[PDB]
Subunit: 459 residues, 4 copies
């Protein structure tokens, strides 16, 4: 009941000596949150992934870098979203399409609200690993760490760390990515279609009166654009980039490719994605993740939680954006809504005074979690909205650019987060919980967030 | 103190026999409102104008026809405006530019309000003749009939009908038209510049609070368009077409040219303009003006005042749109605001039942005139607005398309019409009256009308 | 000790509608030649996996291809179809895929110039992993290699057994390949001027470069002219390369069936394992399962027609596969041999034109011109390939019909598989780099050279 | 009894700023050759009329031309300038204007192909109504015709008197002409493919058609290639034809001065009677009013350089007229004669390049190659014109500089004015249709033929 892949038996060009040195130095540093599987099996899987067609190509990553530059300069806005954890079982056409649709829907609303371009980065085609605080979960089982490592099912065997999951992760990533590319160059990306869905959502949301005026104004803007002779064909094809947390270093090193351009010197690109981030757990300043990020040419992000200090933030900036390339680095604030107004300003002030131009991105989810009385991990919608609101106050008081958001969402009608216009309750949550990890905003709530964020952008 | 033009001494291709027959039959019919100057002098001036480069060319008139078709079908809107009477003395760069600017300004606002394209036709490059009810004016002088015929100065000599004014009219028309074409392909036509002026007008109008929300929504629509990657270069260059009242038949017949296309049969185009209209005075159903309009291939309009009947309107339609070509004919309603709600519906119903698709255009000026206690002919702004409002009610109750407006305006701060946000009074009017005929809405009032019309279009 | 890694498989979506399943079951109860002999229960489980994976292509790309092929069938565009004889899983790499994509784009710019009309680019890629065989025993005494979707090339009994997990492995490879084709076609790889310069290296370095110089300079001057008029790459619609393979393994194709949205038009059945597929010479029985599977799907399709073809049998393909008279829905692919095309093709084309249907007539030069070398290797002569294309063009010019395209087997590798061409590959040369897992392909130079020769035919 | 009609003239706008007027008065106190001799008070009244008319051109078109000519000066574009020797008011008709516009567009597509770079199209039109003279008495014993802006062509004393109302008549004609040029350049007249087909009629019907066939087919195939790649007319930026004339009559030019908006850049002085102007051979005194008027305006300008030119005098033109080093602000127009260009041009170009400035080097073949026929008429030989262009190109190739353009006198009429060419116009032929009111123009065929020959020079 399985498929069989050969271990090739030459293949990669050898790295120039300095890249090999710097890559080895980076991987020899300590690395948190890594799977515990045998080195020889890891090595065999890396040798397979070293021969595969990449998920992305370097030109796409260079274009993304240029678009991110604009965001860092206060002339575009970044929307990053999708599943908390993608699963092999739900890597289907409807699930992919629903996430693509939700992202495009949010994006048009935010574009209108910001009056500037929106860069769309999905959490997709690789978001298959997660860190854990505890090795042992509530049931006394070894913790689930996403499908790149082990299985979600609640038995011990399924929780064993499996290295064959690295190659399965790629098979799933490459399939999803192929479809995302097909979808972004189809009618799914027509602005006028994508907007139409907003019209359904205003009708069928119980808070629709609340969003009606903005949705009609967007509709009018779109018609106005058409009225001036702009048809879909002339516009740029929609671009949705791929991202995940660079967690599993066995996966990410096997997906490195050596590439030309940008002054003609060889560079390493992680071709498992367009951009990756380093989470709070793995961001050790001398650890392998950060040192790995220094070696790759892709845009990167770092998650900054409530014990971050202005000084450590600056050191992240100096280490990861050493050439001062606007857009190369994104700092992702995840403070909690009760803390973002106090904790973010001095980080922002200090980083701004270095002269570097980073993207300030708000992740209003990770700081605002709690277990419910009914058993399911969950987040209140109002706290999410309030963190983003706080984030915008911080930048407005400083005259800096609130550059983006990073959310966990899905294009399905899941019940995972409390609240919204549907008023999802603790009792409601049990009925439809579909996440393999953290609770995502459903279709309706992610849309509603886009509308509220658009108002924060307009004011 | 004059320039000297030779009478050529061959030049036009001979008309195909049927065009010559139909043209002669049309001109032999009686013609109201014609200048009384000697036939031999008229003939010499026609012979000069028969050799000149035309003001327009047929392809432009074919494109206009296609754009008017859209308006007749309920998918675009027509804005027609400029001077009541152009004068030789004010045919200057600033005056032309101010009228061009005012038209483009109004057009963007109306485009947003209608959510469909707006066709821009200026009263320009030929609007040099007007009909009169009385031969003798208030001062006992022979009436001024526009600079194509005679002079505005209040003495008898200057009021003599002069045929050399036909060639001077063309010299002025061709100059103005050259500049309109230069202007529409310059930065003057950038939408984002043109909109910016709206911002000045909201600030400096005393009713600016009233228009602020719509002006900000338009600004947002424009930014949104830019945010999606639409730059000025991609858009169609702005097109402003030329029109005047086809009054002086000596002028209009001399400006006829024979042309190919549209099924390859020879057609006559009046190359003095893109489209012309027939006013209330000259619209005799068996008169030379209407018969002339039947022979030319240009889009035409007919002014319909308060004694129009549904039956005569149908006969205009059958005579002028005999092939059923949407857009070929525009019926211009000029009823007065107190009468438009009663008089227009049955005309519209009857014409709609013929199957022809005309453009319904409102001229809310000509029905709403009065002499003031202070001496100057004048119009109240509120009555103008109310006629347009009535016009829209009529079409909305019938489900027909309110297709356009036809206004007299200027890009200067004249005091000619009573009212508006500036609250121009009878006492105010004397200080700045600059028209050679009827009172035009000034810059501010024509803008304000565009905003109010945009709201009528949105509701 | 086996140098393999096993990959486990596991929950599905709605089934296809019952009424459509009823039709499909009826068509697929027809006999099917050349099918793998794995067990039914395992094939079923693998099909169940593939019924819910993300598709390789999507319906609106196929509807778009249909519109472009309608243009080819009406005589206003030209079809270029080309790539590996058989893709292998071990060679399904970035460089190999980049090279085939490059080679197709290079051929296309040249044929576009020659033809003065748009060229539709269809690769044999992302699924060309199954082939028929004549003998169930090969020269080494083993059961025959059927393509990676069925068994392995290695000359070992274990590897030659029919393994249905190879259906999923095929999918994984097709989807990765297609992902990369999409990426590359929207990159600078597709820029017209860049791709042409390659053409210029080719003239510089080919030993017959002197004779293609003129057409190459002319192409270059055409490109520089485009650009001098203000045309930048941003002004041109992005490069579209479509995927195709021979629809052979019906467990794979049926599991990749999908129903469209229905928003554009009533929902229709598409094979989303590719954009277009063709039925080969050995599986085109008129009453067989291949031709019937082809009738049921909405994709454009092809049928290979070899020297035994009769004009009446060709007419039956047209009535079965283009019942609604949709231009470009059916391609007839002539593969007759260069010594026979001039005789055998004309009456097929007369009979088919007389039906009123608008098929695309495509030439496959390579298949009918295969032979063995004295040095062992299977091979084809470049001149014979060329001459079949020439003869195909003469038949069409004589008849007043559209020579609509070519279908060729090529790689962007500098392999030594076909004899002849400007490099004058010899029988001794074949052992240098004979890399095909099936028939001899034109190498990178030969495939370009062929494109320059077909451009001259298009101009004539 | 006079067959004329008189047209009366009449209230003005702000004057030009005082500080700018002060500068202009100083420059125009310099002596001015070849000026009309009408009275000052009447000239003044006519200038006052022209100071408030709508301009012929507007500043942003001139700033755009400047950017395109900067590209010519850097070696990435080519200048085509062409039209009537002298426009007449009586021939300023739709057909005559359409014909010159067509001829320029036809030449341009061919030279664009040849050069593989954009061609900037500048017509001599909408103001070419004044010419210098050598003698104040002509062959009929009358004072000389100076162009319609000064006096009339008819051989009568009354008509030859200098009439300043002709300044306004010139304006009226220029503006009408320009209006029509603008209309035509945004019509189907400007569509690349349509204009080329004309080229194809020309090959069919020229008696030397056989020798331009190859380049014409190649151009055609380039166009069909553009279109096969998806380029439609809507994808191309609209045709821009710029207006130029010789700035000769300083009452006209000064009255047409305008100050720009200043929004783009600090407001500058532009002659809005045209987009660009040049100073002729007889009015280019370094300390004269023409060169000084040219220093004060922002338009791009040209200076004609004939056989008496010295490299030092050329350097002074560069320092006076391109003081800020703005590429393409100055064009140097060589008109040396075909027997002299190879000798005389090289040291001028060496000296000017050594200044660091980037001028456009333009060839005027026609002017230096003028002679009288045995049959009376003034005339030029096609071969000599051709050979001067050839010699100009050799000088530049030898020096490594950019042969930047040509400047020619042409019409779209089938006139018989220049000798030679494929029609082999003879001395007897000249009386058939000698229609120029001044020098012999290339007719429609000859001007196209020249374009095909210069394209070959650009390719070489
Ligand atoms: N995959 C190699 C890195 C590498 C990447 C690209 C190369 O071309 C070569 C080596 C590693 O993990 O060590
Ligand atoms: N093409 C190689 C590697 C591969 C593995 C898994 C894939 O999903 C894709 C490619 C194989 O099939 O063995
Ligand atoms: N001007 C002519 C009409 C006409 C127009 C065009 C022609 O080509 C000829 C005649 C008239 O008034 O009678
Ligand atoms: N070109 C003719 C006719 C003409 C008359 C007046 C113009 O405004 C333009 C042209 C002339 O100058 O006599
Ligand atoms: N998501 C399923 C099916 C799948 C199989 C292979 C792929 O290559 C892609 C998807 C799995 O992981 O088993
Ligand atoms: N409007 C002025 C000036 C003018 C003169 C000639 C023209 O050709 C144009 C405008 C006039 O009528 O006298
Ligand atoms: Cl290495
Ligand atoms: Cl790349
Ligand atoms: Cl006639
Ligand atoms: Cl036309
Ligand atoms: Cl689709
Ligand atoms: Cl301007
Ligand atoms: Mn999460
Ligand atoms: Mn009026
Ligand atoms: Mn084969
Ligand atoms: Mn001359």
């Amino acid at each position: 009941m399985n498929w069989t892949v050969d271990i090739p038996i030459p293949s990669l060009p050898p790295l120039p000596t300095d890249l090999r040195t710097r890559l080895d130095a980076a991987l020899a540093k300590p690395a948190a949150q890594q799977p515990t599987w045998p080195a020889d099996q890891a090595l065999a899987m890396r040798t397979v992934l070293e021969s595969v067609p990449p998920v992305t190509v370097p030109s796409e990553i260079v274009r993304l870098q240029e678009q991110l530059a604009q965001v860092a300069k206060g002339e575009a806005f970044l929307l990053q979203g999708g599943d908390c954890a993608e699963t092999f079982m739900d890597n289907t056409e409807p699930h992919i399409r629903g996430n693509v649709r939700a992202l495009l829907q949010m994006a048009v609303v935010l574009t209108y609200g910001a009056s500037m371009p929106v860069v769309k980065v999905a959490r997709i085609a690789g978001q298959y690993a997660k860190p854990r605080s505890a090795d042992i979960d509530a049931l006394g089982l070894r913790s689930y760490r996403g499908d790149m490592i082990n299985g979600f099912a609640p038995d011990a065997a399924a929780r064993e760390h499996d290295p064959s999951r690295l190659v399965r992760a790629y098979a799933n990533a490459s399939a999803a990515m192929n479809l995302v590319r097909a979808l972004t160059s189809s009618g799914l990306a027509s602005l006028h279609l994508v907007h139409d869905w907003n019209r359904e959502f205003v009708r069928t949301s119980p808070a629709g009166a609340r969003y009606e005026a903005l949705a009609t104004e967007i509709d009018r803007g779109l018609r106005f654009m058409s009225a001036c002779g702009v048809a879909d064909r002339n516009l740029q094809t929609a671009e949705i980039y791929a991202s995940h947390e660079a967690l599993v270093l066995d996966y990410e090193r096997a997906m490195l490719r050596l590439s030309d351009g940008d002054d003609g010197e060889p560079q390493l690109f992680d071709l498992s994605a367009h951009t990756v981030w380093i989470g709070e757990r793995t961001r050790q300043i001398d650890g392998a993740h950060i040192a790995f990020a220094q070696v790759i040419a892709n845009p990167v992000g770092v998650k900054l939680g409530p014990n971050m200090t202005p000084e450590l933030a600056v050191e992240y900036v100096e280490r990861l954006d050493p050439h001062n390339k606007p857009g190369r680095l994104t700092l992702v604030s995840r403070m909690g809504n009760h803390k973002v107004r106090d904790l973010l300003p001095p980080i922002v002030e200090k980083v701004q005074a270095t002269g570097h131009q980073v993207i300030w991105q708000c992740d209003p989810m990770h700081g605002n979690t709690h277990e419910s009385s009914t058993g399911f991990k969950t987040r209140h919608f109002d706290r999410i909205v309030d963190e983003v609101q706080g984030f915008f106050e911080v930048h407005r008081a400083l005259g800096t650019h609130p550059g983006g958001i990073h959310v966990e969402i899905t294009g399905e009608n899941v019940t995972e987060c409390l609240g919204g216009a549907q008023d999802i309750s603790e009792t409601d949550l049990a009925g439809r919980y579909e996440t393999a990890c953290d609770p995502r905003l459903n279709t309706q709530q992610s849309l509603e967030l886009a509308f509220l964020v658009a108002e924060m952008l307009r004011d």
